Design a protein around this nucleic acid. Structure first.
Lengths: 127, 93, 156, 106, 49, 27, 197
RNA sequence: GAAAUUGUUGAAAGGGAAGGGCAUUUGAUCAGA
RNA sequence: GGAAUACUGCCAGCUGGGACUGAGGACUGCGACGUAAGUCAAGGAUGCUGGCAUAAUGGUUAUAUGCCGCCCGUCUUGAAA
RNA sequence: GCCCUGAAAAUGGAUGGCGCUCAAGCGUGUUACCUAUACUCUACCGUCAGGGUUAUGCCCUGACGAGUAGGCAGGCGUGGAGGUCAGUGACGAAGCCUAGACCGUAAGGUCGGGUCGAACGGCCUCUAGUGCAGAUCUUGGUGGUAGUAGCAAAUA
RNA sequence: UUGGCGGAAAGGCCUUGGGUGCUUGCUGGCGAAUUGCAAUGUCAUUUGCGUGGGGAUAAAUCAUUUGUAUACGACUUAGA
C-alpha cells in the first residue's frame, strides 16, 4: 500500500510528565522545565524522571509517519482531497472533526475513486 | 513468622491470592461480562463503540445498569437513520 | 482549508537496490557428520529417537531413515544443527539416495511412492544393520538424559 | 521410558547487577553440573526456556514459555549470562529453567 | 513443652458438668456425652486402648 | 489409629496443610 | 541435585553453614537442618556466653515487648545467624526463609531419611587442632533453654532404633555382595568389567 | 453544567505510609495491516 | 661432547565455537582470481524455509516482583533540619 | 613484628549487619573475576566547520554535545484586526467527560466515542490588558478534624 | 488379606497368604509416516452441578435475668 520505508523506532514511547503532576491536581501533566537550583530533577539525580532533549529526536526518514507508512493530511472537502491525487503512497487523508456525515460519504467515495487511504472512516457513519 | 518459623506464610498467602483471582476471572468469563475475541462475530473491533447505539438496537430487538439513552438522542438517531436509508434507496434506484 | 498544503512533495519513485556482493556458497558441514552415521534427534515429532544419516541435500538439510521398520521414523528431512552425531556408523553401499531431492518432499493420506521407496531402502539398510549386535535394539530405543549426565563431558 | 528429558536443568539467579544497580536485559543462569567457564563454553549459544503455567487457555494450552539464548560466561564458578526476547520478571529468582542441547556443534 | 495426647472420660456424668459444657441449657437437647457413653459398650475397646 | 473419626479428621487436616502449604514439618 | 536436602548440624560451624544455606535458599533449594543442639562455634564457651549476654542486654527501653526478641534455642540462634545474612525484609528473602526448617534433634519424618554434611563448614576440617570451641546446647542451656534433657532422652531411643535398622541392612548387604561375587567371573561380568562396570 | 469534595455499583491492592524511575510477568482493554 | 625443553618475541600460519550490529539503496573506485570469458568475501546482507494471519507480537491501563528514589519554591558559602 | 594493659561514664547498639579464628583478621606475592553517564565500534538526533550543486533548499565528509546568574536564536499557545481558504456547521458550531487512537525531543496538535444545541477554525500578516503552583496573594467554593468538642449556672 | 512395630510434629515401616496383570532374562511377527527442517509442544484433587450413595435430625448470638463483674463492649449466672 504505502512506500517501503526504514523500520520505525521511536527512542521514547513513554510520555514526558511534569514533576508532582501525580501529587497535585493543580499541576498538570503538560511538561514544564524545573527552574529551581535546589531541584533534583534539574540536577539529574539518579532515580528521577527523564527530561526531553534533542538526543531523543526521531530519524528524519521516518518522522511524521504513522505505522501504515503515511504522513497524515487533514481534509475537509473533496478539493482538499484532490490535492493528494498523486501522493497516494506517501500521504493519507484524515477527515476533520467538524465535518458532517452527509459530506463524509462524499469524501470517502471520492477517496475510493482516486485510490486514497482515509485514516478515520466510520466517523458518524455507523448507521 | 517468628512465632512459627518452620511454617510458610507468604507462599501460602500468594497461592491463596492466585487461586482467588483465577476463580473470579473464570466466573466473570462464564457470566459474559468480559469482551470476546477479536475475530468473533459478536466482536466490535475497528467499529465505533457507543453505549447509546448499543442500547438503541437492543431496545429495538426488544440486573441494574448506569446506561441510559436520552430520548433526545433516540430521536436524533431515528432522524439520521431515515437519512441513511434514504441515501441507500437512492443508490437502490 | 484545514491543513494548507506542503510546497515540497517527495517523488513516489522507488529506487532499485544496489548490487549486493553476497553470493550463495555451499555449506561446510562439521566433521562428525558422514553418511551411515547414527544420529540423535533433539526436537520435533521424533525428539529423542535414534536414526541413521544418508544424504546431504541442496537446501542444507539431511536425509534420514529410522529405519521405519524398527523405530517408526520415515524418510525425513532434518536440520544438522538440531542433531547430535554419534561415533557409531553403518556402511552405506547400494542404497539409492539418488532419487531423493528437495522437490521430492514438496507437499503443495500417504503416497504409495513414499512407502515403496521406504521399503526398498530399508531392506538394504536392515541387511547391513544385522551385522552389528544390538544395533536394531539401539535404534529402536529412545535417548534420554539421566540424573548425573553432563553433555560437555559425555562422549557421544 | 521413565525419563524423556532432552534439556539440562538450571536456575535463574539474578540480573546483571552492580552493588546498587541492575540491568534487567541480562540474566544470570546456574547450570547443573557446570563448575567452570571451560565447561560453560559448551553451553554458550544454546537455547533457554522458562516454562510457566497460567489459568487462561490462549492457543490450546495453559502453559506459556519465554525463550532466550546463552551469551557468555560470568565469573569462575560456571555461571552464564543469558538474553531473552522478553526479560524475566524478577519473581523467578530461584526458579528452574530448561537449557536445550540445540543448536548443536557436536 | 508438655503435650496432651489423650483424655478419657467416665461413663455417666452429671447435669452440672453438662451445664458447664453448655451455654444455653434450658433450650438444648443435652446431647453432650451420648456417643461417648455408647463408646463405653461391651468391652470398651477404645477406652482401654 | 483411634478408628472412629480421628482417621478422617487427621488425614483431612494433613491434606489441607499440604495443599495450603501451611505445615510445620512438611513442605 | 535433589528436591530437599537434610543437613546434620553436628560438627559444623554456625556462620559458614548459615552462609552456604542462605545462598542455597536464595537460589531455590529446600533445606532442612537437624541436630542444632550439637552445633559448634569457634572460641571458648566463656567468650560466646559473654557475646550472647551482650546481645541479651539489648532491649527497647520504653517497652520491652517490642524489642529484640532473644530466642534461647540452638535452632533459633542458627536462624538469627542466617536471617542476618538474608534480606528478610523483602518478599524474596521471606520466600527464601520459607524454604528452610530448623529442628532440635531429628524428629519425624526426617529420622527415616538421609542426612548430609557441608565439608567447607565442618569444625574438624576448617579449624586448626589445639583451638577451643563451644557447643550450642551448652550455651543455650546456660542462657536459659529448658529442654536439653528431653532431646538427649529421645536421641538415645532414635539411635537404638537406627542401630537395629543398620544391623539388618548390613546382613542384607553381606548376602547381596556374596551373591554378586558368586555371579562374578561370568562372561557377562567380564564384558561389564571391560566396559567399566 | 469543569475541578476540589461526596455516594452507589464494578475491578484491584493493602503485616507501622502512599506516590515516582528502569525492566518484565499476570489480568483487563485497544488500533493498524 | 651432543640434543631437547622452558621463557620471551614474530608469522601479510591453519582451524573452530559464541554474542551485538546489517547503516546505505541503478552504475562509476581501488583491487584480487582468471588465457580470455568472466567471477569475487573488493566503496554498508543476501539466499532458503516454516508457523500465525490474530489480540499471537505490540501499545495503553490496574497490580505484583528485583534495584533505585528524602517535599516543592525562595533565601544563604552551605539544611532533610 | 603480632598480642594484653597503656583509663571512660551514664535510654539498648553497631568493623554497615550477619558473623569470621591454619579467618571471612595482619603483611606480602601470583593469577582469574565483578563493575560507571569513563575508553573503542556502530546507528540515530542536534550544532559547528569544510566541500559540491540551474536553492534561508538538496547531497557528501568529519569533529563535537556538562551547566547556575546570564546572553543569543528557532519555535508552541491565547484575545481582537486586514486578506484568503467562493473554509467548517442544526445529517449538529464552540464548550465539557473520555481505561480509545495517532503525530512531535517538547511546548502542543490531530482523530474516534459520549454530552450539548449555535456559532467557529487553517494559512499570509497586524496588534496586545497574552501563558502561573507558589506571593502568611484576591474573591468564591470545598474538605479531614467530626456525627467529634459539646447542648452541665439560676433547687423540679 | 495376616501379624507386629512406631507418640518428638507417631500419619509411616516391615511382614503372611491368595488373586490379578506385566516382565527387556532370551528369540520372533505386525503398526508407527503428512506434527511436513524446530516451536514446553501440554501427560505427574472435588469443593460443582448429571451421578443416586441416599439415611440421620445440633448449637451460639440478640432480647430478658443475675452481680462473684462493669465507663460502654466484655465477664459471670439463671430461664421452655
Amino acid at each position: 500500500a504505502s512506500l517501503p520505508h526504514p523500520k520505525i523506532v521511536k527512542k521514547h514511547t513513554k510520555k514526558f510528565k511534569r514533576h508532582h503532576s501525580d501529587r497535585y491536581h493543580r499541576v498538570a501533566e503538560n511538561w514544564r522545565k524545573q527552574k529551581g537550583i535546589d531541584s533534583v530533577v534539574r540536577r539529574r539525580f539518579r532515580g528521577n524522571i527523564s527530561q526531553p532533549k534533542i538526543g531523543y529526536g526521531s530519524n528524519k526518514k521516518t518522522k511524521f509517519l504513522s505505522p501504515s507508512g503515511h504522513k497524515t493530511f487533514l481534509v475537509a472537502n473533496v478539493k482538499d482531497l484532490e490535492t493528494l491525487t498523486m501522493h497516494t503512497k506517501t500521504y493519507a487523508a484524515e477527515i476533520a472533526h467538524n465535518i458532517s456525515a452527509k459530506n463524509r460519504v462524499v469524501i470517502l467515495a471520492r477517496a475510493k475513486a482516486l485510490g486514497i487511504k482515509v485514516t478515520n472512516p466510520k466517523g458518524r457513519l455507523a448507521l | 513468622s517468628k512465632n512459627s518459623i518452620n511454617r510458610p506464610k507468604l507462599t501460602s498467602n500468594l497461592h491463596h491470592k492466585v487461586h482467588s483471582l483465577n476463580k473470579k476471572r473464570a466466573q466473570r468469563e462464564r457470566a459474559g461480562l468480559l469482551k470476546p475475541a477479536r475475530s468473533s462475530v459478536n466482536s466490535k473491533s475497528g467499529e465505533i463503540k457507543s453505549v447509546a447505539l448499543d442500547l438503541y438496537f437492543q431496545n429495538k430487538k426488544n440486573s441494574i445498569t448506569t446506561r441510559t439513552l436520552s430520548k433526545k438522542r433516540a430521536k436524533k438517531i431515528e432522524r439520521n437513520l431515515k437519512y441513511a436509508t434514504q441515501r441507500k434507496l437512492l443508490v437502490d434506484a | 482549508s484545514a491543513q494548507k498544503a506542503p510546497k515540497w512533495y517527495p517523488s513516489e519513485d522507488v529506487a532499485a537496490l544496489k548490487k549486493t556482493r553476497k553470493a550463495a556458497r555451499p555449506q561446510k558441514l562439521r566433521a562428525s557428520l558422514v553418511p551411515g552415521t547414527v544420529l540423535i534427534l533433539l526436537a520435533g515429532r521424533f525428539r529423542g529417537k535414534r536414526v541413521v544419516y544418508l544424504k546431504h541435500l541442496e537446501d542444507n538439510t539431511l536425509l534420514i531413515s529410522g529405519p521405519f521398520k524398527v523405530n517408526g521414523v520415515p524418510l525425513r528431512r532434518v536440520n544438522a544443527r538440531y542433531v547430535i552425531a554419534t561415533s557409531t556408523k553403518v556402511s552405506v553401499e547400494g542404497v539409492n539416495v539418488e532419487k531423493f531431492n528437495v522437490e521430492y518432499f514438496a507437499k503443495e493420506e500417504i503416497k504409495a511412492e513414499r512407502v515403496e521407496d521406504q521399503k526398498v531402502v530399508d531392506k538394504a539398510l536392515i541387511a547391513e544393520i544385522k551385522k552389528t549386535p544390538l544395533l536394531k535394539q539401539y535404534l529402536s530405543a529412545s535417548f534420554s538424559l539421566k540424573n548425573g549426565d553432563k553433555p560437555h563431558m559425555l562422549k557421544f | 521410558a521413565e525419563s524423556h528429558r532432552l534439556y539440562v536443568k538450571g536456575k535463574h539467579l539474578s540480573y546483571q547487577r552492580s552493588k546498587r544497580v541492575n540491568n534487567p536485559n541480562v540474566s544470570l543462569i546456574k547450570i547443573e553440573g557446570v563448575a567452570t567457564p571451560q565447561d560453560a563454553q559448551f553451553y554458550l549459544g544454546k537455547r533457554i526456556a522458562y516454562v510457566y503455567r497460567a489459568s487462561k487457555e490462549v492457543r490450546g494450552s495453559k502453559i506459556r514459555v519465554m525463550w532466550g539464548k546463552v551469551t557468555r560466561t560470568h565469573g569462575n564458578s560456571g555461571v552464564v549470562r543469558a538474553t531473552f526476547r522478553n526479560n524475566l520478571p524478577a519473581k523467578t529468582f530461584g526458579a528452574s529453567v530448561r537449557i536445550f542441547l540445540y543448536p548443536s556443534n557436536i | 513443652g508438655l503435650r496432651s495426647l489423650t483424655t478419657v472420660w467416665a461413663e455417666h456424668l452429671s447435669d452440672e458438668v453438662k451445664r458447664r459444657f453448655y451455654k444455653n441449657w434450658y433450650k438444648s437437647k443435652k446431647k453432650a456425652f451420648t456417643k461417648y457413653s455408647a463408646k463405653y459398650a461391651q468391652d470398651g475397646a477404645g477406652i482401654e486402648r | 489409629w483411634r478408628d472412629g473419626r480421628h482417621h478422617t479428621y487427621k488425614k483431612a487436616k494433613l491434606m489441607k496443610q499440604s495443599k495450603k502449604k501451611t505445615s510445620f514439618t512438611r513442605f | 541435585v535433589e528436591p530437599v536436602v537434610v543437613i546434620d548440624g553436628k560438627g559444623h560451624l554456625v556462620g559458614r553453614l548459615a552462609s552456604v544455606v542462605a545462598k542455597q535458599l536464595l537460589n531455590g533449594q529446600k533445606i532442612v537442618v537437624v541436630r542444632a543442639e550439637e552445633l559448634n562455634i569457634s572460641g571458648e564457651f566463656f567468650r560466646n556466653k559473654l557475646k550472647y549476654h551482650d546481645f541479651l542486654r539489648k532491649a527497647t527501653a520504653f517497652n520491652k515487648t517490642r524489642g529484640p526478641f532473644h530466642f534461647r534455642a540452638p535452632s533459633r540462634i542458627f536462624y538469627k545467624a542466617l536471617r542476618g545474612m538474608v534480606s528478610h525484609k523483602t518478599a524474596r528473602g521471606k520466600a527464601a526463609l520459607e524454604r528452610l526448617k530448623v529442628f532440635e534433634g531429628i524428629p519425624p519424618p526426617y529420622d527415616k531419611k538421609k542426612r548430609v554434611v557441608v565439608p567447607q563448614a565442618l569444625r574438624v576440617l576448617r579449624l586448626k587442632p589445639g583451638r577451643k570451641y563451644t557447643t550450642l546446647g551448652k550455651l543455650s542451656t546456660s542462657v536459659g533453654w529448658k529442654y536439653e534433657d528431653v532431646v538427649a532422652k529421645l536421641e538415645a531411643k532414635r539411635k537404638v532404633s537406627s542401630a537395629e535398622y543398620y544391623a539388618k541392612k548390613r546382613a542384607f548387604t553381606k548376602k547381596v555382595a556374596s551373591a554378586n561375587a558368586t555371579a562374578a567371573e561370568s562372561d557377562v561380568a567380564k564384558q561389564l568389567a571391560a566396559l567399566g562396570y
